[PDB]
Amino acid sequence: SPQPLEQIKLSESQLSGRVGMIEMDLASGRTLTAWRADERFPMMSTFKVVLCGAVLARVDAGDEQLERKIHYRQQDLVDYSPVSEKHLADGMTVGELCAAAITMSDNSAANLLLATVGGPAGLTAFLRQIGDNVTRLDRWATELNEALPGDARDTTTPASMAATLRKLLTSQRLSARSQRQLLQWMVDDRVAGPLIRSVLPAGWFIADKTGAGERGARGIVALLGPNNKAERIVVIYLRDTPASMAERNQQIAGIGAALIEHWQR
Numbered sequence: 001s002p003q004p005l006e007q008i009k010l011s012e013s014q015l016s017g018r019v020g021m022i023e024m025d026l027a028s029g030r031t032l033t034a035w036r037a038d039e040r041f042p043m044m045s046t047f048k049v050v051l052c053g054a055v056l057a058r059v060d061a062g063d064e065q066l067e068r069k070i071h072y073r074q075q076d077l078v079d080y081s082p083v084s085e086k087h088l089a090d091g092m093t094v095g096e097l098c099a100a101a102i103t104m105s106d107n108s109a110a111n112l113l114l115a116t117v118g119g120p121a122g123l124t125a126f127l128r129q130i131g132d133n134v135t136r137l138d139r140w141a142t143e144l145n146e147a148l149p150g151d152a153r154d155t156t157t158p159a160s161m162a163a164t165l166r167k168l169l170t171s172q173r174l175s176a177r178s179q180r181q182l183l184q185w186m187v188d189d190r191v192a193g194p195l196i197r198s199v200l201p202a203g204w205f206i207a208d209k210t211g212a213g214e215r216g217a218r219g220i221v222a223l224l225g226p227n228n229k230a231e232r233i234v235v236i237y238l239r240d241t242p243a244s245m246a247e248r249n250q251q252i253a254g255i256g257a258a259l260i261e262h263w264q265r
C-alpha cells in the first residue's frame with residue numbers, strides 16, 4: 001500500500017466522493033493524519049457512541065442507572081431493531097439498550113436512549129457541554145442517515161468527532177467505570193468488529209462503530225493499534241459517491257492497510 005495520505009486521495013479519485021479522515025493518538029490527542037478534517041460529514045450510526053457517552057454521564061450524575069429497565073411497545077419500534085424487537089414483553093435495561101445500539105446498530109434502542117437524554121437537542125447540548133461546538137444531532141435514528149447535499153443536520157467533522165471520542169474515553173469527564181464501559185461496547189461491535197479482525201494482521205487491536213447512509217455515505221469511528229493496544233483513534237467518513245457498498249468498504253479498508261503498513265509516523 002502507499003502512504004496514508006496518498007491512499008486517501010486515491011480513494012476520492014476512485015469513488016468520486018469526499019473522504020474525511022483523522023488519525024489521532026488516543027492518550028495525547030496528537031493529530032497524525034488529517035484530511036478534510038474540518039469539513040462536515042453525516043455521522044450516521046456513528047452517533048450511537050456519543051449518545052451512550054451522554055447516557056453514561058447521566059449515570060455518573062446519579063440521574064440514570066444502567067440497570068434501569070425500560071418497557072416499550074411495538075408502536076415504538078423503527079426500522080432495524082434486531083435486539084429490541086425481541087423484548088416487547090420483558091423490556092431492556094438502559095445498559096442493554098446501549099449495547100444493542102452500539103454493538104448491533106439497533107435503531108429502536110438508539111431512539112429510546114435518545115429520548116432519555118432530551119432528544120436530538122439534548123444530545124447536541126451534551127456535545128456543547130463537553131466542548132464540541134460542531135457536531136449536531138437533529139433527527140432520530142432512522143431519518144438522520146439521509147445525507148442530503150448541503151444539509152448540515154446530523155453532521156460532524158473528522159476533527160470534532162475524534163476529539164469528542166477522546167474526551168469521552170479518556171478525559172475523566174466520565175467516571176473510570178463509565179470510560180471502561182464505553183470502550184467495551186466499542187470492542188464488542190458485532191456488525192464490523194469480527195469482519196475487521198478477520199482481515200487485520202495478528203497483533204492489531206480494533207474497537208469500532210460504523211455507519212451508512214444515502215448518496216454513498218459511510219463511516220467508521222475506531223480505535224486501532226499494534227501490540228494489542230488501542231493506540232490511535234481513526235475516524236473516516238465518506239460522502240457523495242455513487243459507489244457500491246462493497247467498494248466503499250474496500251476503500252476504507254485500503255486506507256486502513258496504508259496505516260498498518262506505515263504506522264510509525
Ligand SMILES: OC[C@H]1O[C@H](O[C@H]2[C@H](O)[C@@H](O)[C@H](OCCCCCCC3CCCCC3)O[C@@H]2CO)[C@H](O)[C@@H](O)[C@@H]1O
Nearest residue numbers: 196199200201220222224234236252253256257260261
Ligand atoms: O507489513 C504489515 C502487514 O502487511 C500485510 O497485512 C495486510 C492484511 O493482510 C490485509 O487484510 C489488510 O487489509 C486492511 C484491512 C483493514 C480493515 C479496516 C481498517 C479500519 C480500522 C480503523 C478505522 C478505519 C479503517 O492490510 C494489511 C496491511 O497491508 C501482511 O498480510 C501482514 O502479515 C503484515 O503484518
